[PDB]
C-alpha cells in the first residue's frame, strides 16, 4: 500500500454517533482545540483559549493521565449515577445525551478522581522509598 | 572536586554535527525554546511563541510521548521515505540535510503516528477489559 | 476552500433574536466606520 491517501472524519463528525464510534475521532477535536481595539480583542480571545486548554490539561494532570486521551482509573463507578446497561449506552446513545444526563455529578466525580489519585500517588511513594 | 566548572554545548551548537552527536543536545534547545503599539506587538509575539510551543507539546501528547524527549513507536519505518543505512545516517549526516531530504513525508508520518497511537490506546483498553 | 462538515443524527435548537453574532457585527461595523472616518479631515469651518 503506497499509492493511497489518508482520510479521517471531520471536526465534530461523530457528534450524533455512538460512543464507541465517537471514541476514535478525539484526535481531530484535540488538535482543533488549540488601530489596537481589534488586536486587543483577538489577543484576549487567543489567551482565553490558552487558559481554557491549560485548565483542562491541569485537571487531567492531577489524575493518573499525564497527557493520554483514553485512560483508565482505579476508582469504582457508582451504579446509582445511571443504573443503565453499558451496552445500550455505548451502542444506542450519543455523547450529548450522556452529557446532559449526568451533568450534575461530574463535578463531585472530578473531586474523588483528584484526591484518590493523590493518596494513590503517595502509595507508590511509600513503596518507592523502600529501595 | 570542589572547583570543577561545568560547561555545555551552546544553543544550536550541534547543528553541523552528526545525528548521534546532536542527539545529546536536546535539553538545551528545549529549555531555550521559551505607547500601545509596541506592547501589543511584543505581547502578540510572546503569545504566538507560547501557542507554537503548546501546539508542539500537544502534537507530542497525542502520541505516546507525553513528556519524554526520546520515545519509540511500534509502527515500522518503510524504505519509501528514506532507504539509507543506519551506520551512516547517524554518523555521516546532520539534522538539516536529513530534514530537507524527507520534508515531503512529514505529514504522512504524523498521520500514521496519530492513528497508530489511537489504535494502540484502543487495544490497551480492550486488553485491560480482561 | 473552507471546510463544511455535515453533522447528521443530531438536532440543535436554533434561536435567533438572542444570538450575539449580530450584536458583535453591529459593534464591528460601528468601530470600522469610526476608524475609517479617522484619517479624513474635519469640517469645522463650514459652520458660518
Amino acid at each position: 500500500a503506497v499509492g493511497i491517501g489518508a482520510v479521517f472524519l471531520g471536526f465534530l463528525g461523530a457528534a450524533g454517533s455512538t460512543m464507541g464510534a465517537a471514541s476514535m475521532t478525539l484526535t481531530v477535536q484535540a488538535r482543533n482545540l488549540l488601530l489596537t481595539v481589534w488586536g486587543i480583542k483577538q489577543l484576549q480571545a487567543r489567551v482565553l483559549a490558552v487558559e481554557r486548554y491549560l485548565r483542562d490539561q491541569q485537571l487531567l494532570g492531577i489524575w493518573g493521565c499525564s497527557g493520554k486521551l483514553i485512560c483508565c482509573t482505579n476508582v469504582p463507578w457508582n451504579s446509582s449515577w445511571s443504573n443503565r446497561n453499558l451496552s445500550e449506552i455505548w451502542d444506542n446513545m450519543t455523547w450529548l445525551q450522556w452529557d446532559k444526563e449526568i451533568s450534575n455529578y461530574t463535578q463531585i466525580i472530578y473531586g474523588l478522581l483528584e484526591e484518590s489519585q493523590n493518596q494513590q500517588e503517595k502509595n507508590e511513594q511509600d513503596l518507592l522509598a523502600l529501595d | 572536586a570542589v572547583g570543577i566548572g561545568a560547561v555545555f554545548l551552546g544553543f544550536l551548537g550541534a547543528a553541523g554535527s552528526t545525528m548521534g552527536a546532536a542527539s545529546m543536545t536536546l535539553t538545551v534547545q528545549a529549555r531555550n525554546l521559551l505607547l500601545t503599539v509596541w506592547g501589543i506587538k511584543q505581547l502578540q509575539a510572546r503569545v504566538l511563541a507560547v501557542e507554537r510551543y503548546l501546539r508542539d507539546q500537544q502534537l507530542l501528547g497525542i502520541w505516546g510521548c507525553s513528556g519524554k524527549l526520546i520515545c519509540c513507536t511500534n509502527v515500522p519505518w518503510n524504505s519509501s521515505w528514506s532507504n539509507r543505512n543506519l551506520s551512516e545516517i547517524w554518523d555521516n549526516m546532520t539534522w538539516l540535510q536529513w530534514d530537507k531530504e524527507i520534508s515531503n513525508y512529514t505529514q504522512i508520518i504524523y498521520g500514521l503516528l496519530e492513528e497508530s497511537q489511537n489504535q494502540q490506546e484502543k487495544n490497551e483498553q480492550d486488553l485491560l477489559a480482561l | 476552500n473552507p471546510q463544511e462538515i455535515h453533522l447528521e443524527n443530531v438536532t440543535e435548537e436554533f434561536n435567533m433574536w438572542k444570538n450575539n453574532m449580530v450584536e458583535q457585527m453591529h459593534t464591528d461595523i460601528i468601530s470600522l466606520w469610526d476608524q475609517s472616518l479617522k484619517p479624513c479631515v474635519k469640517l469645522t469651518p463650514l459652520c458660518v
Partner: nanobody
Amino acid sequence: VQLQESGPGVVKPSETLSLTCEVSLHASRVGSYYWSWIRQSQGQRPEWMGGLYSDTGNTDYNPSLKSRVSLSRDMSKKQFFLNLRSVTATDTAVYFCVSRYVDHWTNRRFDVW
C-alpha cells in the same frame, strides 16, 4: 465522490496536451486524497503515468516520462491538471483520473474511477 475528465479530444502532434479532472470530495471526510492519471490504449493494458497527494503536493511519475509529464493541483477549485509535452501518435488513448484514499471511518478503499 465523482470524478470527471475534461480536455481537448483532438490535438495536433508535438505540443503539450492539457487535461483537467473535476474532483468531488465527500461531505464530512476532510483529509488527503491521492489523485492519479492512468491512460489505456485500444487493445493495450493500462499504464500509470503519475500520482500526487492533495496535502503535501509531492508528485510521482512513470520511469519513461521524466521530460514529458507534469502534475499540478489547486485545492481552491478542487481540480488537478495533466500536462503531457511532446505528444506523439502513440498517445491516442483513453485517459482516466482516479482517486485513492483509505476511509478510516468505514475501513474502505474507495477506488473511484
